[model samples]
Target: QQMGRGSMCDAFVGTWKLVSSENFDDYMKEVGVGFATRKVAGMAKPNMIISVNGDVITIKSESTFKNTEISFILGQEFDEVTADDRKVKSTITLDGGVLVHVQKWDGKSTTIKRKREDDKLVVECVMKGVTSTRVYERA
Candidate 1:
C-alpha cells in the first residue's frame, strides 16, 4: 500500500481543499437528508485537514455552513455522529492504497472509499443506490 503525501498509502494525512463534488444533491436525498440540508450542503465548499498519529486518525471538515471533526482508531468500530447528525457504527479499514469506511445505521449500510493518487484525492460514497463523489487537491 501507499501513507502520506510523500507516498501513496497514507496520502490521507494532509490539508486538502475541495475542488469539486459530484451527485451531491441526489446522494443526500438517498441518504434521507432533509431538503433544506441537502440544498445547503450542496452549495457549501468544505476543507479537510487530515492527520494520523500511530493508530489514531483525525479528520476535520470545515465549511461555511458547518464544521465537524471525527477521530477514530484504524480498523476499529466506533460510534459516529455523521455530518447530518445521524448516529451510526462506523469502521475504517485500509487495503493497499484504498481506505474503506463503512457505516451502519437503521439496518442499512453506507460505504465510503478514499483513494489517493499523487496530489489528488478521490472520494466515493454509495447509499441507497446513489453515488456521490468528491475530489480534493493538496493544499
Candidate 2:
C-alpha cells in the first residue's frame, strides 16, 4: 500500500537492507568520500531507522560492522556528529515532505535530504557545494 507523508514518519522505523544505491558515484564525488571510503561503503550493508515523536525525529543507522544515531528537531540547529559513518553534525529541518540535514566535520560542511518517491527513497547530498542525488529502493 502507498503511504502518506504523515504515515511515512514511522514507515522507515523498521529494518531495511541496502538494496541498491544510484548516483552513488556523484554523491561520493560531491562529498569527496575517499576512494577507500567509497569502496568500503559500496561493499557495506547499511540500514536506517526513524523514530518520530512530537516534533523530534531520531534516526539510527546500523550495519554488521558500524552503527550511528542522530537526533534532531524539525527546524533547529544542533551540534556535530562523531559516530559511525558520519563525521559531521549540524541542524536538521523538514520541508516539502523532505528531511533536510546539514552537517560539518573537519572544517567541511555538507547538507543532505531524504525524501520518498513512490515506493523508493531518495537521498540527496549537497557536498562541496554540489548537489548529488542518490536513490534507494525499499526492501
Candidate 3:
C-alpha cells in the first residue's frame, strides 16, 4: 500500500539526535536487560542514522554506552545481537511511513515502531506491558 510514496518513505533516512525518552528503564527491564547495563542505557543519549539503499535499510545507533547497527531487507528475518547482548531474530516492515521492527529471543518478543511526526522522529518500543516512547530531532 505504501509502494509509491517516495518522499514519505525516504523521510526516515537521516541523522537524528535523541531529544527525550520516557519509561525506557522499565522497557529494557521487561526485555531482561541487566541492572548495570540498564542504568547506563537509561542515562545515555544516542544518535540514530537511518539510510536505505536499494532493498536494504540500515539503522545505526551510536551512544556513549553502546553502539549497534543492523542492515536488512524489509520483511526478511535476520539474526541480531541486541545492544543489551541478547541474540534474537529480527524483522522490520514498513507500513506507509511507519517502520515496525520485531525482535524475538528466548520465547520473548518486542515491537518497536519508528515514524516521522512533526519533523521529528518518534520511536515507540513495547515489551510485555511496558511501553517507552523516545523522540528525536534531526542532527
Candidate 4:
C-alpha cells in the first residue's frame, strides 16, 4: 500500500539500486576503511531499501559483500556500526525533504545527504574535505 500524502518522508520509501559511483574509493579511505574493504566496497553495486513508520525510519543496504541496516527516530542520535565496521554516533534528519545523515567518531565526522531527483536517489558523502557522489535509480 502506498503511504499517505503530505509526509515528506514517504518519498524515500522504496528500493533503489546503485547506478553510478564517483570517488567512492577515496571517500572510504577518508573514513578509515581498510584496503581490502575499500576495494570490495568500491566495486559493490548495492541496493538500498528505505521505509518509514511513524517517527522511525529504516534504511537497509544490501550487496553480495555484506548487508547493513539502521533504524532511527528522526532527529535522534544512535550508535551505528558502519558498513566498514566503524562504530559511530549517527543522526539522520530531514531537511526540506532531503535526508541529512551525520556520523561522528574518533574526532572525525562525515556527512551524507540523500536527496530525490525524479525517480533517482542521489547520495552525496563528505568527509575531511573529500566528497563523493553516488547515484541510484528506483528498483
Candidate 5:
C-alpha cells in the first residue's frame, strides 16, 4: 500500500534552519508552552530535519532543551505526541508546488505548508483557526 504513493518529494529531504517566525505564540500556547517559554521560543532559531523514504516521512525539530521527531505516511494518518504534551497526529500531502501537512495536536488541529522561495523555504502554519508564517533557510 505504501509503495503506490510514488516517491516522496526529494527537495524536502534535508536539514532546514528557522530564520524567522510570525504568529508562533499561538502555536506555542496551544503546545503548552508557557508565556516566558513562548517568548524564548519566539526568539530562538529552531532547526528541523526532514527525511523521506518511499512512503515514510520523518520530521525532527531540535532546540537546546527539547528535540522532537514525528513520523507518518505520505497520505495515511496516525496518532502522535501524547496527552501529557499534546499528542499530535499528522498526514502529509502535496499541493501544487508545496508540501502540505495537516496535524492534530492537543485537541487543536493545524495545517502547515512548505514551499521553496529562492534559497529559503517558507513554512506557513494555520492552526487554532488562525494563520502563522515562518521562514527557514537550508542548512
Candidate 6:
C-alpha cells in the first residue's frame, strides 16, 4: 500500500542505483572526507532505497564498504553525523517536488536536493563552491 496519497514521499520511494556522478570528488573533498575515504567512495556504487511512513522518512544508501541510513521528518531540523562521520546540523524540507536538505558544519553549509528527472532520480549536492550531481536509475 502507498504511504500517502499524492504525497511528496510517494514519488521518492524507490530503489535507485547509482549510474553516474559528476564532480563527486570535489564535493567530497570540500566536506573534509579524507583521501582514502574519497577513493573508496569514488569506486563504490551504492543502491539507495527511500521509504516513507506518513511524514517520517528513511533513506538508505547501501554498499559493501559502508552503508548510510538517514531518518528524518519533513520540515524538521535535527543533528546528524554523516556517513563519513561529519557532525552537522541538518534541516530538510520538501520544496516543490524536490527533497531539499541543508547541512551546516564548521561554519560552512551544504545543500542537497533529490528530485526525479524524467526516468531517473537526480541528487544534486553543493558545498564550498563545489557542486556535483549523481544520477540514479531504478533497479
Clashes of each: 4, 2, 0, 0, 3, 0
Candidate 6 Cα misplacement greater than 4 A, ranges:
1-4
Cα lDDT tens digits, model 5, 1-139, are 5454544377777899998888888866755667776676677687889888766788898886457887877688887663135567877787777888887864767788998888788998775666778999988
lDDT of 3 by residue, 15-126 (tens): 9999999999999989989999999989889999998877888999999988999999999999999988999999999988889999999999999999989989999999
Among residues 3 or more apart in sequence or in different chains, the pairs in candidate 3 whose N, CA or C atoms overlap within 3 Å are none
Candidate 5 regions off by >4 Å? 1-8, 30-33, 82-84, 105-107
Better of 2 and 4 by lDDT: 4
- Pairwise lDDT winner, candidates 1 and 5: 1
Alpha-carbon error at 139 in model 5, in Å? 1.2
Alpha-carbon shift of residue 15 in model 6 (angstroms):
0.7
Candidate rank order under TM-score: 4, 3, 6, 1, 5, 2
TM-score of 1: 0.90
Give the Å shift of residue 19 in candidate 5.
0.8
User: Which candidate would rank higher by TM-score, 1 or 6?
Assistant: 6
lDDT of 4 by residue, 6-105 (tens): 5788788899999999999999988889999998888889999999887789999999878999999989999999888889999998999789999999
Error of model 4, residue 19, in angstroms:
0.5
lDDT of 6 at 100: 95
The lDDT of each candidate is: 0.85, 0.68, 0.92, 0.92, 0.75, 0.89
Prediction 6 TM-score vs. true: 0.93
Please report, as a residue range, the 10-residue window in candidate 1 with the lowest summed lDDT: 1-10
TM-score for all predictions?
0.90, 0.73, 0.93, 0.94, 0.78, 0.93
In the predicted model 5, the residue pairs found to clash are 80-88, 81-87, 82-87
